[PDB]
């Protein structure tokens, strides 16, 4: 009578991740197999990962993708947390590249289409799996990609850049190895490009013995292009593995590519059933619209299960509004629009980010402090360059909050950034009044 949880008997260890160990889960009554990730509560509490573990549980339950490890149930005990999730018999992709060698152009395409579909699904739900590698990517008996180990994934916050860096020197974008600030999606595409090179060639595009020369190869962005792979797939790998994050390919760029378009199934990138795609909820705002019009919130909860009756008709109407692109969004490069204004006679003016300075960074900090002390400002110094200024409006009587961060453009060039923090008077206007009052005082 071996170790049992919830009708499930624990067996052989699959492996050990960044946090906890995964052990094979076998049903006693039926014989169904699950992967049980055992996270020791004491080891989670010993570090500040308690917040990262909470988000990882919430995100895995929120996801509903056929190419992502499905989380069944999170069993909690006083000593440790148990995560009962989808088991895949085929094993890791890294072992398949070593055993079977380089996968055929058509077969490797199918696996790349499935892996990118899961990466695209994560980006839609504002989650970025920073540790993408064939070790973290698993396969089943029917040979289908499944992404696991979300312990290194982080949320996509509006007006925030994540500088945290993953351990693996390979599969990490040039901005990651340099330790510079970046946005989440660009790294996942670079991580997908190196994976695309892995099953097509068999080896890594940037590989070296010692760490310093390896970093020089990634920053250079020069990789070997073999003779066997065609002209179409070669152009994709070059566009996917770019040094510049803006010049690099995006989720829309790969979907529009000729090599990727072929052998692509219909269920991979849906447009109409994208609203029901997320398991977790109907839009929270959406529920209220139905609550403010007819019934109190939490109404028809049984009804939603029942299907008797209403909110689904409002969600289906949102899909029709999202279908027409020309009405809700503008396209950047045809007959001229009647509301288009002719150019003014005196050159087009060009917008720029905040205010720039050429003086020492220590001098700019002393300059922003003396300007803030002149007005009635109250803040909290987080970092030697990061400030969270708060000013109370005298007319409305409401508190207005905004962020300040110092950056550098070139060797002798410096920049100051103004960010708005959401809480009678307009919030968007009050942030502008708070900004103008500091820019006018400073020089």
């Amino acid at each position: 009578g071996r170790v049992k949880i919830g009708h499930y008997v624990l067996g052989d260890t699959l492996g050990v991740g960044t946090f906890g160990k995964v052990k094979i889960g076998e049903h006693q009554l039926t014989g169904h197999k699950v992967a049980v990730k055992i996270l020791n509560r004491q080891k989670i509490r010993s570090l500040d990962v308690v917040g990262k573990i909470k988000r990882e549980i919430q995100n895995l339950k929120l996801f509903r993708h056929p190419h992502i490890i499905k989380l069944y149930q999170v069993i909690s005990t006083p000593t440790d947390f148990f995560m009962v999730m989808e088991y895949v018999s085929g094993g890791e992709l890294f072992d398949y590249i070593c055993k079977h060698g380089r996968v055929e152009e058509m077969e490797a395409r199918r696996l790349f289409q499935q892996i990118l579909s899961a990466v695209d699904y994560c980006h839609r739900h504002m989650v970025v799996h920073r540790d993408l590698k064939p070790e973290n990517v698993l396969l089943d008996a029917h040979m289908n990609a499944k992404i696991a180990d979300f312990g290194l994934s982080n949320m996509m916050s509006d007006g925030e850049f994540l500088r945290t860096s993953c351990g693996s020197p390979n599969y990490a974008a040039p901005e990651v190895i340099s330790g510079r600030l970046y946005a989440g999606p660009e790294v996942d595409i670079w991580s997908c490009g190196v994976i695309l090179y892995a099953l097509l060639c068999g080896t890594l595009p940037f590989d070296d013995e010692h760490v310093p020369t390896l970093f020089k190869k990634i920053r250079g962005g020069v990789f070997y292009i073999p003779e066997y792979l065609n002209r179409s797939v070669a152009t994709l790998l070059m566009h996917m593995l770019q040094v510049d994050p803006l010049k690099r390919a995006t989720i829309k760029d790969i979907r529009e590519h000729e090599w990727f378009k072929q052998g692509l199934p219909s269920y991979l990138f849906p447009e109409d059933p994208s609203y029901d795609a997320n398991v977790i909820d109907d839009e929270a705002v959406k529920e209220v619209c139905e609550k403010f019009e007819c019934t109190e919130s939490e109404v028809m909860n049984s009804l939603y299960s029942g299907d008797p009756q209403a909110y689904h008709l409002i969600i289906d109407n949102r899909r029709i509004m999202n279908q027409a692109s020309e009405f809700y969004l503008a396209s950047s490069p045809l007959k001229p629009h009647p509301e288009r204004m002719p150019p003014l006679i005196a050159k087009k003016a060009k917008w720029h980010l905040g205010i720039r300075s050429q003086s020492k960074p220590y001098d700019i900090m002393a300059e922003v402090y003396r300007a803030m002390k002149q007005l009635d400002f109250e803040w909290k110094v987080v970092n030697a360059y990061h400030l969270r200024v708060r000013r109370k409006n005298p007319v409305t009587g409401n508190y207005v909050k905004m962020s300040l961060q110092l950056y550098l453009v070139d060797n002798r060039s410096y920049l100051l950034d103004f960010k708005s923090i959401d809480d009678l008077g307009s919030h968007t206007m009050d942030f502008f009044e708070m900004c103008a009052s500091l820019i006018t005082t400073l020089a």
Partner: protein
Amino acid sequence: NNSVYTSFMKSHRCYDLIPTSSKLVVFDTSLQVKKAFFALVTNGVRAAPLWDSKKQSFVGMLTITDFINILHRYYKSALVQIYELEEHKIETWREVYLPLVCISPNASLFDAVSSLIRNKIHRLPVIDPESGNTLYILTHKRILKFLKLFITEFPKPEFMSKSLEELQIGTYANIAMVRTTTPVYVALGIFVQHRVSALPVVDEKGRVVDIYSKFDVINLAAEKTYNNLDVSVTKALQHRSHYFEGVLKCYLHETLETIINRLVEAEVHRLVVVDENDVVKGIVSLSDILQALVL
């Protein structure tokens, strides 16, 4: 059940009309009125709401109508500079010219269309109650374009396929118009007198050749030709001559469904009507169509 056009509104909120990504301009009452009209040209926006720093809330709405109103009142001649336009601020002229007229995004479409008809305005801004800031500036063109999107799935009734002669939509009598030799100052006076968005440029025989709308006035500020209003309306519309696919005109023997489909495709506000041969005939605007859709 009989009125399917009314059911499209009321049930649908104002939020659905607001695009995913938009451009909005806000002017502080303390800046010069001449610099504000020159700012609308550089940004390409037709209208922009006004903000008061002392009151800490939106007071007015700056439109091209204000630029029309200034000129009739203050223009002296082509020789004498309009000393008022340059010196006047947004707040100073606001005290001379005549509550905030706006709508909520949570509020119904039926309550938004009624606000444009009752207050007799073309541009109505939408302000969030929880946030306090402006989101979008609603227009008659945007409401009908939103209707043409949802009405395709619904079957149109008998009155939707009715001719212009049988229907009562559009002001058939006392139509104000300009001629090919009529100066800009005389044309601008009609915009303040009769209070209409479009003025049709009609030949001495009775043939419609061009159309001078409130938007065509912004060209005087764009080219800085506002100092000479003595010149004819043909000279004021000489800029579009190279890139213009003729004036939009429909017939009296045309169905309401065809008339609505013509306005959304052309993206124009007022639609000229002529019979048999080009001739003066009552003009039908979006304000007539939207009023008929409500009642």
